[PDB]
Design an enzyme around this catalytic site. Sequence first.
Site, short mmCIF file in Angstrom:
data_model
loop_
_atom_site.label_atom_id
_atom_site.label_comp_id
_atom_site.label_asym_id
_atom_site.label_seq_id
_atom_site.Cartn_x
_atom_site.Cartn_y
_atom_site.Cartn_z
N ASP A 65 9.81 -13.58 6.82
CA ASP A 65 9.27 -14.93 6.93
C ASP A 65 10.25 -15.88 7.59
O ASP A 65 11.30 -15.45 8.07
CB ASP A 65 8.70 -15.45 5.61
N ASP A 70 19.88 -16.47 1.18
CA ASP A 70 21.31 -16.62 1.42
C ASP A 70 22.30 -15.89 0.54
O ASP A 70 23.41 -16.38 0.35
CB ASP A 70 21.64 -18.12 1.37
N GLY A 71 21.94 -14.73 -0.01
CA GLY A 71 22.88 -14.02 -0.86
C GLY A 71 22.97 -14.62 -2.25
O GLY A 71 22.17 -15.49 -2.60
N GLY A 73 23.69 -16.91 -5.41
CA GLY A 73 23.89 -18.35 -5.55
C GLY A 73 23.08 -19.23 -4.62
O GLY A 73 22.34 -18.74 -3.79
N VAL A 75 20.24 -21.19 -3.03
CA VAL A 75 18.78 -21.05 -3.12
C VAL A 75 18.39 -19.86 -4.01
O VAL A 75 18.83 -18.74 -3.78
CB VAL A 75 18.14 -20.90 -1.72
N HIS A 78 11.67 -19.76 -3.51
CA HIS A 78 10.87 -20.75 -2.80
C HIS A 78 9.41 -20.34 -2.80
O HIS A 78 9.09 -19.16 -2.94
CB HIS A 78 11.39 -21.04 -1.38
N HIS A 91 8.38 -16.40 -3.74
CA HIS A 91 9.37 -15.35 -3.49
C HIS A 91 10.67 -15.65 -4.26
O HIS A 91 11.10 -16.80 -4.35
CB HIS A 91 9.68 -15.24 -2.00
N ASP A 94 16.57 -11.64 -4.87
CA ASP A 94 17.08 -10.59 -5.74
C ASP A 94 18.59 -10.50 -5.71
O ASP A 94 19.17 -9.63 -6.36
CB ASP A 94 16.44 -9.23 -5.42
N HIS A 113 8.69 -23.54 -12.12
CA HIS A 113 8.91 -24.55 -11.10
C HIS A 113 8.26 -24.13 -9.79
O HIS A 113 7.56 -24.91 -9.14
CB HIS A 113 10.41 -24.77 -10.89
N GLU A 114 8.50 -22.89 -9.37
CA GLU A 114 7.92 -22.39 -8.12
C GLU A 114 6.38 -22.39 -8.16
O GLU A 114 5.74 -22.70 -7.16
CB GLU A 114 8.46 -21.00 -7.78
N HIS A 117 4.83 -25.58 -7.13
CA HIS A 117 4.68 -25.75 -5.69
C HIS A 117 3.45 -25.03 -5.15
O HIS A 117 2.76 -25.52 -4.25
CB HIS A 117 5.92 -25.25 -4.97
N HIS A 123 8.31 -32.89 -5.29
CA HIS A 123 9.42 -33.20 -6.19
C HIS A 123 9.31 -34.51 -6.93
O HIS A 123 8.75 -35.49 -6.44
CB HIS A 123 10.77 -33.10 -5.46
CA LIG Z 1 19.13 -8.88 -8.65
CA LIG Z 2 20.55 -17.15 -3.21
ZN LIG Z 3 10.28 -15.97 1.44
ZN LIG Z 4 11.23 -27.32 -5.79
#
Ligand SMILES: [Ca+2]
Ligand SMILES: [Ca+2]
Ligand SMILES: [Zn+2]
Ligand SMILES: [Zn+2]
EC number: 3.4.24.17
Length: 162
Positions: A65, A70-71, A73, A75, A78, A91, A94, A113-114, A117, A123
């Site tokens: 997508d 970002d690995g 920590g 984010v 979403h 999503h 992991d 929370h997700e 959305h 927010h």
């Molecule tokens: Ca994991």
């Molecule tokens: Ca992350």
């Molecule tokens: Zn995604």
């Molecule tokens: Zn949010």
Amino acid sequence: IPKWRKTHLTYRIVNYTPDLPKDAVDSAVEKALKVWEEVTPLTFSRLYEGEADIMISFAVREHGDFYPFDGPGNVLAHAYAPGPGINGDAHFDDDEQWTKDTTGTNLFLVAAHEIGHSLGLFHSANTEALMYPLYHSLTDLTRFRLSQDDINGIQSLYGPPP
Ligand SMILES: [Ca+2]
Ligand SMILES: [Ca+2]
Ligand SMILES: [Zn+2]
Ligand SMILES: [Zn+2]
Ligand SMILES: [Ca+2]
């Protein structure tokens, strides 16, 4: 309009994170859906194959997508606004270690929370609201409750329960 055309949505957990037992994942998502269900006329039901309204999955980095993860920590997850296809999907990164207690990255909390959305909520500037932008947890999970702000937001879109 910023919302769903029907009051009943289907959901499917496409895959499972190995961080928790299969059952804890189901329980987390179910509770998350239930909190919104309690304050509106909306209802949900699960599917196990095929495309459902809300497709939930766990992924890492680039996963097909526009917003690669970002690995570890930062984010954590979403979701997309109401609509067909990818819209309404949630999503989860992991690269996080998902838990079911107050120690680290609680699945239920993030999912609740997700899902907000996925139903059309934006927010809140209220520090106490579920829809507040900055991540945080709770000392005691049994004390969770939506703020009136969260209630008014979802109800202005779908109305109160009968
Ligand atoms: Ca994991
Ligand atoms: Ca992350
Ligand atoms: Zn995604
Ligand atoms: Zn949010
Ligand atoms: Ca969808």
